[PDB]
């Protein structure tokens, strides 16, 4: 028997069971979890990784839940994660060199013995936010889901306590002991004995890296009377410059406690321990929504490369699904099936939904040698009767888009949109907070009730609709930043119940230029008649007929996943350069439609090039201009007046 | 000490006077204002309303200090807000030792139990004439921290107790005390919706209720009979209380089973008896005026918290 | 361990220095001038040498440098010593400075971790402040508390507090000491506050900043509001700001084990920030005579210079002309009383939206030497003009580098003019009336000077400019601010199909990546030098 004090954790038995589970795991969870070819799920990781020289690895919880001999390991890595991982980092090197025994190799063995190893349990048992952590369950592997507000700078920490003796041309050295230093006062008695003569230098010593992150908590359930909390934590080195503002996150870590000082003056402390979280792994992406522009973030990619930390930045693909995509694109009912699939719970709204999807393609992101940039974003407006799915559409897009914020009515101001400055409650120092405009930099910026908004708040969007650049000049802060988000929002009519026979470029309670510069608008008038109403009636009732609408899957609808991944590969790998035929159909379209300004030109091109991105063309074509100008005149309903 | 061998908190609750009158008191529902000084720590029941409670958080009761060299433990005890740690080795083997190898602490062996505060405010009908009512604090620990949420009738029970403050060191004469009370039990005449479970009598209540029949219009009759007629609107309020049915799309959306109602009409006819009966009976209820503090008081605040530095 | 190493480094390095001499004969074999470098230095007794990294890391395959660059400070005292030897060797009251410029690598501030400590490492960033010259404790005497026995030595970097040894040790407590001021050596100081640059930044981001400190004669080469490329070593310093933070906190304590029977623990808390130092910094961000001699000889080069300054934008020649004379300043001196003029000129334009006004801003801020784009609205004048510190970090206050204080000999391109506040236009008026400013807060008074030449952006009331009314009823900005303006412009459109078609052609051709549509007479390069010639011609 071997065992730890206050503990039921064996080292070598854990190593053996680890190794046996490791040699034995072959998509077991497909079998035991569910009904769902391959072989030895895990082992391929450990065969591949060696030649690339990396000291990391990821790991599920379920594969322990699936394999026989790992059910007790689950509750033990759970309770003693840093201890169980101080084991497994050794068991892993053990399994490594127990697996190399069956191989003869060029002399790479100068390194692996000098190497370290570490693990990252990510997809784990769910936890309900923060309130659950009454003190019974502190210091345990934990999972969470939320987004980012504020990032600190780097905390260093003594990691090698260098020490300069004053005499005898001698240095000295000593390391950290559960997080302290006990300076050796003496002077190395043999050579010289001066029992408190020694000095300290920083430039010698070894420093750690630590960072702290403010986070907003976004549960799935809340109690009666709930509201946000803002939590701090600690990440450590090799994870730096990963998670920042503008990201939703699923995460893991360990909940813990700590006291603080009463002052900078003495050691008298608080009865109540400030809580926090130490970090184990972060999940930057997920399945139910697409990901960042791959062009936007290049410097961060090459940085993570240089740093040899490779926690994900972009979802990865399979070739069989690439072929699946080239198959699904061969058919011609794309242009409608995308539409029918965006919103099965809703009636037709064809052009509306198509425009939503074309903005989700976005468009073109070109730059100039030094003095140009033209971004893939087309600002969108809606208008018409209430009592439709305008608001529903908008909630839907705000969910499904990764990087975006929602605004409503007149409860907003320029201060809470561009930069604002504030103070921390712990450090009591002057630290900033990013603005809801810039948070969506790349993605969605959603609004409702655009009309009643203050003219102070409505004044800023003059420039954001052009350059994706806000500027600030206020206290101790001067910097023109970038806000590549797109705009997508509702308007409400002049008065109530409409005025069919009037220039609707005047019938809004909104002036011309603000409205003309929108790349496109959509219209929601009623036109009451059956053949559009009864059908919608059953369309929305049969939703309620079921506990949840799965039998809405009829009438040819896709799933979200193949869709979204097709979209992501599309967004990330094609560049349609503009063609010559489309010129002569675009120019005449614009000019003849002028009978109301030059921005709808930019609208047509930025949307037709997205039409080109769709179908997976690496080229635009004359035909895209056709549906472009067509659906434009269908949008504002050219025929009536 | 024996305190770290305790796997059990205790939380009292006092009698309901219905039983004290059986065989024949001590603690009646009392005020923020009617303490009378001498009631420090005596057994008590206060009513009122909770404005703001902070979030639950942990707090030591007993330290776990272990020795580097002796390999033995030390039990440093605190009951104050504060203490000063124990660094030099006063151990029992180091007592009979020249060298005094340093000790340190634990993060798991060291006992813990939470600590959360709450503020009552006084009930209207018991404020005397023309008088601005006043405030009070309570301290809670551990288990019952989750039975409190602002905006409710309550009967806190426990004991009113002192603590070390003297004002602020100029307007003083000595021996002065800031103070607090102990939480041990919560009853509230308002039963929230998530405390529902049937039994062998309340199911009987629902039975004999439904047995009579005409149940729908009977309800909408019993809604605020103080005011006359208009059963059609009493019924509409009843349906507002029902809310509807929640349905989920399973595609990244749901839709509310929720209601929104209005009663346009001229003056003279009764209007407000309705809303007051509503917030009288419905829990999680709220009244506002039209103008005044409508700017932000319908909206989210920003505030620092008393008992802990945090932006709530 | 480097008691053995560092002197070998000294020997190898002074050998490197001496074995190289002034070669480059006929611009051929470069041999390294460090011998004549310190010669020409001793001419003036500046003691403040430069080093190149390249000509160092050639010899010995650079493996010398590979480890030196990480373990600099360990060998640095020995580095300076060999120089002193070489100076003693080949030249006949001495303190010194050193710097290494033209490093290959750049690291942003985010690209700096805890393994570059004591490491030379080149960063570039931006400035928002300077601070006060305060001469620094290089050497300084002390004296016995029981005799006149002086000690002319110093613990220098930190640990600036206490020597031990006395010449006549017979003392009851030789542990502590006295002091003195004059038998001492000092050297200048300076502090700035260093800042991110825009063209390298992330999302959800603030320009994360931090402090850097100077030394020696290389000071006065700082500047506010400009990009710079620093080089020095990862100096750090204590802090307590980092309190209230999670997890566990290091703490120092002397040992009480192996010796016994001798806050009594003498415990200090230790927690630090990562500042930086600079060995040297530079201001980032000929046949030209023949170039400009050829360009000038034309006559319509006026029209060329006109049309070449916004090929990104289409037409509106007046904008081009006005902006091309805006940088050009008027002689503010032509008086006798000493009552003076606002020699420069000022601008604005009007036009409905769906117009290319902001293109001009983005142009000139993308061209200008000195400039800034800002809100127009989302700003207090405490942001435009300078709100300053009140006696923080112990030392005295320092005027903040004002935003509108900027544009000395230049421009403050400001959009969104109409939605300005009450007090900001007030302050602007005060800025325009004279070419001077007055400021105060906390009793402190200020006085500054500038000759700012604004171009900015009009936004009419409803946007629609009724062509049959006058300017004032539509502008909505009071008279004096509407006055002082040498110029107003208007840009308003109408149906012209022949020209609208070619305009849309230009626009859509611009969605051809970096096409040749902007083919000018010439580019920004020669333009900037042409400006620096022309600004000072004095007609
Ligand atoms: N139908 C009624 N029966 C009895 N009392 C009524 C009736 N209508 C009005 N009242 C009395 O007149 C007052 C009407 O006030 P109310 O209509 O509720 O508020 P407001 O008039 O400000 O909207 C009430 O105090 C109520 O007692
Ligand atoms: Zn020594
Ligand atoms: Zn001991
Ligand atoms: Zn002496």
From Swiss-Prot, chain A:
It catalyses: ATP + H2O = ADP + phosphate + H(+). ATP binds at residues 384-391. GO terms for molecular function: ATP binding; ATP hydrolysis activity; DNA helicase activity; DNA replication origin binding; helicase activity; single-stranded DNA binding. GO terms for cellular component: CMG complex; cytoplasm; DNA replication preinitiation complex; MCM complex; MCM core complex; nuclear pre-replicative complex; nuclear replication fork; nucleoplasm. It is an enzyme of class 3 (hydrolase). A motif (Arginine finger) lies at residues 516-519. Residues 334-541 form the MCM domain. It is found in: Nucleus. It comes from the Eukaryota. Its EC number is 3.6.4.12. One of its GO terms (biological process) is pre-replicative complex assembly involved in nuclear cell cycle DNA replication. Its main location: nucleus. Belongs to the MCM family. Component of the MCM2-7 complex. The complex forms a toroidal hexameric ring with the proposed subunit order MCM2-MCM6-MCM4-MCM7-MCM3-MCM5; loaded onto DNA, forms a head-head double hexamer. Present with 8800 molecules/cell in log phase SD medium. Early fractionation of eukaryotic MCM proteins yielded a variety of dimeric, trimeric and tetrameric complexes with unclear biological significance. Specifically a MCM467 subcomplex is shown to have in vitro helicase activity which is inhibited by the MCM2 subunit. The MCM2-7 hexamer is the proposed physiological active complex. This is DNA replication licensing factor MCM4. It comes from Saccharomyces cerevisiae (strain ATCC 204508 / S288c) (Baker's yeast). The chain holds residues 177 to 838 of 933 of the full protein.
UniProtKB/Swiss-Prot annotation, chain B:
GO terms for molecular function: ATP binding; ATP hydrolysis activity; chromatin binding; DNA replication origin binding; MCM complex binding; single-stranded DNA helicase activity. Present with 166 molecules/cell in log phase SD medium. Early fractionation of eukaryotic MCM proteins yielded a variety of dimeric, trimeric and tetrameric complexes with unclear biological significance. Specifically a MCM467 subcomplex is shown to have in vitro helicase activity which is inhibited by the MCM2 subunit. The MCM2-7 hexamer is the proposed physiological active complex. The gene is MCM7. Disulfide bonds: none annotated. Belongs to the MCM family. GO terms for biological process: DNA replication; DNA replication initiation; DNA strand elongation involved in DNA replication; double-strand break repair via break-induced replication; nuclear DNA replication; pre-replicative complex assembly involved in nuclear cell cycle DNA replication; premeiotic DNA replication; silent mating-type cassette heterochromatin formation. The chain holds residues 193 to 507 of 845 of the full protein. Acts as a component of the MCM2-7 complex (MCM complex) which is the putative replicative helicase essential for 'once per cell cycle' DNA replication initiation and elongation in eukaryotic cells. Core component of CDC45-MCM-GINS (CMG) helicase, the molecular machine that unwinds template DNA during replication, and around which the replisome is built. ATP 1 binds at residues 228, 268, 270-272. Keywords: ATP-binding, Cell cycle, Cytoplasm, DNA replication, DNA-binding, Helicase, Hydrolase, Nucleotide-binding, Nucleus, Phosphoprotein. One of its GO terms (cellular component) is replication fork protection complex. This is DNA replication licensing factor MCM7. It is found in: Cytoplasm; Nucleus. The keyword Thylakoid does not apply.
Curated annotation (Swiss-Prot), chain C:
One of its GO terms (molecular function) is ATP binding. The modification Phosphoserine is found at residue 205. A motif (Arginine finger) lies at residues 483-486. Changing residue 357 to A: Loss of MCM2-7 complex helicase activity. It comes from the Eukaryota. It catalyses: ATP + H2O = ADP + phosphate + H(+). Acts as a component of the MCM2-7 complex (MCM complex) which is the putative replicative helicase essential for 'once per cell cycle' DNA replication initiation and elongation in eukaryotic cells. The active ATPase sites in the MCM2-7 ring are formed through the interaction surfaces of two neighboring subunits such that a critical structure of a conserved arginine finger motif is provided in trans relative to the ATP-binding site of the Walker A box of the adjacent subunit. The six ATPase active sites, however, are likely to contribute differentially to the complex helicase activity. Belongs to the MCM family. Present with 13400 molecules/cell in log phase SD medium. This is DNA replication licensing factor MCM6. The lineage of its organism: Eukaryota, Fungi, Dikarya, Ascomycota, Saccharomycotina. The gene is MCM6. The chain holds residues 103 to 763 of 1017 of the full protein.
